[PDB]
Amino acid sequence: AHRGLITDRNGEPLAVSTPVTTLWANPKELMTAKERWPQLAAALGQDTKLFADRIEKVPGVYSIEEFRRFYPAGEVVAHAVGFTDVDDRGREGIELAFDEWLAKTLALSIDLRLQYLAHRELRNALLENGAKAGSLVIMDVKTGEILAMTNQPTYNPNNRRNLQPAAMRNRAMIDVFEPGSTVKPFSMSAALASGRWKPSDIVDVYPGTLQIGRYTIRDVSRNSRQLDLTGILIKSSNVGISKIAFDIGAESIYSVMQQVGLGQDTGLGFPGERVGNLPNHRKWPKAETATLAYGYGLSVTAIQLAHAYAALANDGKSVPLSMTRVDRVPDGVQVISPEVASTVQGMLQQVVEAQGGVFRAQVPGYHAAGKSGTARKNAYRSLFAGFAPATDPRIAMVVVIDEPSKAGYFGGLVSAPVFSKVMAGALRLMNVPPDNLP
């Protein structure tokens, strides 16, 4: 049976059926032309005796047209597309998730142009920083479509030999990690929604440490005393966000993170896909309120993180995630009030653009918003999550760089230049008009 074509969103082929032949034979018609057996084996490329024992233009040898898959883009979309086995059955990715449907053309949400850009830049960043692995997710904030999803290391699905187990993992969907400072905008959304905090309110975070029993909350950058809420985000102050969290209570923060999908089911029927964990306590301990607020008290995937930022970018409205091309966009759910989402967007723009901010995440020609983070796995993950253009957001992106060995001090900000280059390239390919012109 001829398997359905898989294409990218523009009709580019990603998985195609090619005809193969099971040269079958009954052990009774062949047995009438034994003198022809050696000649068969010689053309077939098998040993005479092995073939003769196996049986025990040739009579009894007939063709049966069978099918097999090939992947025109190879390693570039290996994890999203996946592959079929010898018997042409979906064994990984979309091939497995849409197996019944395929065994009818299926258009993915992936834009192969953005996929080649993301793959290349993620690969270059891994080589420059001496990193072990990486992942990069690009989402259309208006449609919920996954426009690019790349993982490094990757494999060639057309050449499945000497494969390393590391290359097979769909990291963007299966690797669970603590998002760290990238979840502070959700902690800020709870603070703003509480009615107790405004962006201009000040928190005293000096000396960049805060003692809670035998536990010590520490900021990475410790040159601060009074910080407003934008400053807490710019400086990644774990101390500052913990004090806000003690004032608003962990329950308000847990609700926002739950609503944006952190540690929750994305709704995608993608095989292997992880959920991570968003803890919930009857009575929250002081240290867990703080660790939740600064991103160490939960575990998420890169897809959930991009999805959460896509909701923030889309004025607090969450559009369901999709791995297939979206023609009719679903209604979406208001997860953060639009006024709060709008204020948090403004602060995240300042994180990238303000003096002392993440300047390497700046996108030439556009206003961009985002937040960097480190995930302490010594070993760590460098993270960057953001969206652009900040005035009418179109794309949300998450960059994950695992164990950058060549990064010294400022190692945690290794993901920010990748976001800049991939965001600039994606917006230009998408013909997005610049919103930052002097």
Tell me, yes or no, whether 345 and 221 share the same domain. yes
* Distance of alpha carbon 178 from alpha carbon 25, whole angstroms: 58
The dihedrals phi and psi of 315, each to the nearest 5 degrees, come to: 50, 40
For residue 86, the tally of other CB atoms under 10 A from its CB is 9
Cα angle, residue 288 at apex, residues 380 and 192 outer, rounded to 5°? 95
* Distance of alpha carbon 369 from alpha carbon 313, whole angstroms: 9
* Distance of alpha carbon 192 from alpha carbon 186, whole angstroms: 10
Domain end among 337, 353, 369: 353
Residue 175 lies in a domain: yes
The dihedrals phi and psi of 16, each to the nearest 5 degrees, come to: -130, 145
Tell me, yes or no, whether 12 and 69 share the same domain. yes
Tell me, yes or no, whether 326 and 179 share the same domain. yes
Contacts of 337 by beta carbon, 8 Å cutoff, 6+ apart: 193, 316
Which two structure tokens, joined as six digits, stand for 221?
């950058």
Tell me, yes or no, whether 250 and 382 share the same domain. no
Contact status, residue 2 vs residue 66, Cβ threshold 8 Å: no
Residue 125 lies in a domain: yes
Residue 162 lies in a domain: no
Question: Which amino acid would we find at residue 273?
Answer: E
* Distance of alpha carbon 346 from alpha carbon 340, whole angstroms: 10
- Give the active site residues: 181
Tell me, yes or no, whether 188 and 311 share the same domain. yes
Q: What is the CATH number of the domain that holds 434?
A: 3.30.450.330
- Give the CA count within 13 Å in the CB-facing half-sphere of 3: 30
List, in sequence order, every residue forming a beta bridge with 148; answer none if it has no partner.
Answer: 138
Quoted resolution (Å): 2.0
Contacts of 254 by beta carbon, 8 Å cutoff, 6+ apart: 278, 279, 280, 292
Tell me, yes or no, whether 329 and 348 share the same domain. yes
Residue 183 lies in a domain: yes
Residue 270 lies in a domain: yes
Residue 328 lies in a domain: yes
Q: Experimentally, how was this structure solved?
A: X-ray
Q: What is the CATH number of the domain that holds 221?
A: 3.40.710.10
Tell me, yes or no, whether 58 and 68 share the same domain. yes
The dihedrals phi and psi of 109, each to the nearest 5 degrees, come to: -75, -20
Domains identified in the chain, total number: 3
Q: Which CA distances in Å does 36 have to 33, 39, 53, 61, 100?
A: 5, 5, 15, 11, 42
Site of tokens 């949400």: 109
> What is the distance between the terminal CA atoms of the chain, rounded to a whole angstrom?
59
Residue 164 lies in a domain: no
Tell me, yes or no, whether 307 and 422 share the same domain. no
Encode burial over 93-122: b for 16+ CB neighbours within 10 A, e otherwise: bbbbbbbeebeeebbbbbbbbbbbbbbebb
Residue 51 lies in a domain: yes
Contact status, residue 321 vs residue 340, Cβ threshold 8 Å: no
Domain end among 353, 376, 395: 353
Domain end among 109, 125, 146: 109
Tell me, yes or no, whether 91 and 152 share the same domain. no
Which two structure tokens, joined as six digits, stand for 109?
């949400």
* Distance of alpha carbon 143 from alpha carbon 168, whole angstroms: 29
* Distance of alpha carbon 190 from alpha carbon 195, whole angstroms: 9
| Residue-number span of the structural domain to which 219 is assigned | 170-353
Tell me, yes or no, whether 104 and 1 share the same domain. yes
Tell me, yes or no, whether 205 and 333 share the same domain. yes
The dihedrals phi and psi of 253, each to the nearest 5 degrees, come to: -75, -50
Determine the 3-state secondary structure of 128 from DSSP.
helix
Tell me, yes or no, whether 146 and 222 share the same domain. no
